[PDB]
Design a protein around this nucleic acid. Structure first.
Ligand SMILES: [Zn+2]
Ligand SMILES: [Zn+2]
Ligand SMILES: [Zn+2]
Ligand SMILES: [Zn+2]
Lengths: 270, 270, 69, 252, 47
DNA sequence: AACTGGTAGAGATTTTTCTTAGC
DNA sequence: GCTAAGAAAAATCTCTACCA
DNA sequence: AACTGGTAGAGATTTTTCTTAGC
DNA sequence: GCTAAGAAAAATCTCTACCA
């Protein structure tokens, strides 16, 4: 058999730290045993899993960061779902300037979700007081993981390239920062719908407001309740609201949850 | 028309530095004119071309590099076509130690091509004298481009991971370096043919020698010269050697160059 | 006399339209972008450029070749 | 096919060939040829190295010679203690596959460092060619001494001239081609032995012609696309696949 | 670029009234801008 | 127990549009 | 009068550096 | 005028192999 | 005696960090 092969492969991995294919070809043991022998070693197991996440893209979510340029401190805030950039220059990296900039941004545009890193200025009592008064959900990323707020770092790269492009037309650096914001916002097209940033954020917020008013005026005068049968057992659930009657399936709302049920397992009561 | 649009787009790109889609949508000019307007700007044009090269993989080509670990200077030489690692520890980063290591490597294995970077020790009179005496073609990479010798940097990463895996079984660092060389060479399988590094370099050099002797003994007793017709004009070329007669095409050798010619445009003379 | 001038202008126009390219390259320790140069040889992976009567070898990943219409 | 197998059996009965010559001539697969060779009652090292220490011009040289081809690897030591000998043995075991070391009864060869290196590298150490190779190497060193400044440069150049320039033997090959060909032949033998065991872990029930009964369990040798080679009654035969049932055998 | 070619094509059509394919083959501009140059002339007609 | 990489540009390859010769 | 070869022009896909 | 990114591992998805119920 | 459902085991494809 190969039981002495299993014992000798355990001692040989204890000494040499082979991979599983070398033991499975030298000692003629099956591959599952060699993979388990490799998997039960703590000196091994140094590798990720090779996958990427997907950040939030709600229509009222902003991300914020701070960067350095020519010894100055720039602060960048980006609306995520369209790519809308606001930027300022701070005299220092304290918490009062970040709280004042966040208050100005919350006074200009509707903000309901803010995403930041674990810096010393974003986690402060002044920023917490501004978030409490303006009712903003403040969330932080994982420490030492800059890929969480990837949008604002990409916008840092774009803003620095534009600043290096139009540097020779201004004297100070603050004027060049504001001109780079204008050039990025209204003079660069291409993307989702062929829009710039300002047309895209206008379209997103206007479509959100119009579809909320339209679905309220539709759903306030509805009828035709639907009793449906789903689950691993053939049970019956209570009163659900019919949303759309389609050729093949229907859309039901139950407990403020939307589901798609085929037409064989549902009955409509007027 | 759009000629005033072309002039206004030239002034607007002179001021704002738009991309081509913004001008082609605002001023209603065709896209080739907007692309040429963008292409004639020196403040723009900051981008690569997004492609990768392919390094040499001849069966007698070696790459060399030097790295640091625990305040010591390791030197790594890698046979490219199989992945065969030799490594040593130097007392200093001068030229005499690199020349002595290159002489030992040239005395052990057949070396006909060496690839290095532009370091201060690889470009020296001692290394030039060793390369002249051992008849080695020494080539350098582009400065500040570490992707040229990518194989030896990848092998630096593998050797450092193995050194961190088996560090607690040795006292000094030189013994751990030699044990990591042994573990990488003979205790890790997987790759092209399921071999390790030593079996692959043995197979490569043995197959090279055997196929040279076999094709010499085949080609020394040949016949059946072939006159063929190729080119943009229907001309006729001189005496060429027939290599293999295949169903659909033939292989000819002309002026020590190999070509594949279909059977319609060739005639064989015994 | 005039016909030979016509054939000479044909050949000179073709010769002038073969290989009049510009190359913007990126080199140095701090990878900055530099001005235009003339392309001499273009193989797969790298190019050879002449700038200021100096020959440099730059990979194709760090250069942009602007052609002519 | 079967005519080729019977011709190979008669040829091995007459002349006692090897399996490579029969597999090349009679056009049979190599597992059947190795089976025919292994079934003969009358027909039944590439990894051994020798070590030596010598003195030359106030320095201590250590020479390791592969015996089966004559392959010299030399180095210059600063002293003659056990730790540098163990370090040179570890480098030699890191570059080439070593499984049997042959030394003399020196002091620095009998040490805890050399014992720990042989234990970690799993090398059989045996205390008892090399004098002839030392004579040839020292004549080459005295031949090209004037072209080098130090002694180590002349040592490495003499190793290069001995390995890749001096040609001799039957076919007129150097030492590097001989050691590479010998190790490649050993690699081919080990791979074919692994394939032989993995195929021979089966069993075949075969059914003869003009009979509806299954016969005894014959051992599988080579499973083809249309033919199946089996061993039964100390005899090899070829049965088509439509009269066979291949089952797994748990017969340890 | 061919922007100076477009300016020279405007001057040359203002003097000699060329057609579109002739200017597109001489001054090496694309055919759309040459056809538009011929189209803007009140005396000429693209044919 | 409730967290996450993305943006813009350079070429290569496929598709649509426009002018003109042949029947 | 109608169809199709052929060339230009626009739309789409794949791949890379940089921001921390 | 002659230069260039690559290696190994973790999961997901497809394919081959083995045991056993039904006719 | 023969076929096929079903589950385990091996082979193949796609994607990422690190070396400078
Ligand atoms: Zn392990
Ligand atoms: Zn520009
Ligand atoms: Zn025999
Ligand atoms: Zn006109």
């Amino acid at each position: 058999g190969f039981l002495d092969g299993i014992e000798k492969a355990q001692e040989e991995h204890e000494k040499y730290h082979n991979n599983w294919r070398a033991m499975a070809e030298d000692f003629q043991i099956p591959q599952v045993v060699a993979k388990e022998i490799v998997a039960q070693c703590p000196k091994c197991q140094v590798k990720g899993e090779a996958m990427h996440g997907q950040v939030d893209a709600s229509p009222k979510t902003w991300q914020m960061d701070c960067t350095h340029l020519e010894g100055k401190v720039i602060i960048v805030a980006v609306h995520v779902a369209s790519g809308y950039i606001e930027a300022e220059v701070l005299p220092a990296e304290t918490g009062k300037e970040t709280a004042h900039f966040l208050l100005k941004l919350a006074a200009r545009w509707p903000v309901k979700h803010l995403h930041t890193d674990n810096g010393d200025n974003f986690t402060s009592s002044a920023v917490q007081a501004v978030c409490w008064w303006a009712q903003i959900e403040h969330t932080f990323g994982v420490p030492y993981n800059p890929q969480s707020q990837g949008v604002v770092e990409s916008m840092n790269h774009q803003l620095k390239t534009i600043i290096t492009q139009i540097r020779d037309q201004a004297e100070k650096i603050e004027t060049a920062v504001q001109m780079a914001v204008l050039i990025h916002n209204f003079k660069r097209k291409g993307g989702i719908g062929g829009y710039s940033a300002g047309e895209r954020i206008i379209d997103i917020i206007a479509s959100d407001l119009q579809t909320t008013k339209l679905q309220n005026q539709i759903s306030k005068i509805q009828n035709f309740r639907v009793y449906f049968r789903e689950g691993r057992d053939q049970q019956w659930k209570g009163p659900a609201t019919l949303i759309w009657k389609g050729e093949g399936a229907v859309v039901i709302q139950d407990g403020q949850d939307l589901k798609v049920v085929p037409r064989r397992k549902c009955k409509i009561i007027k």
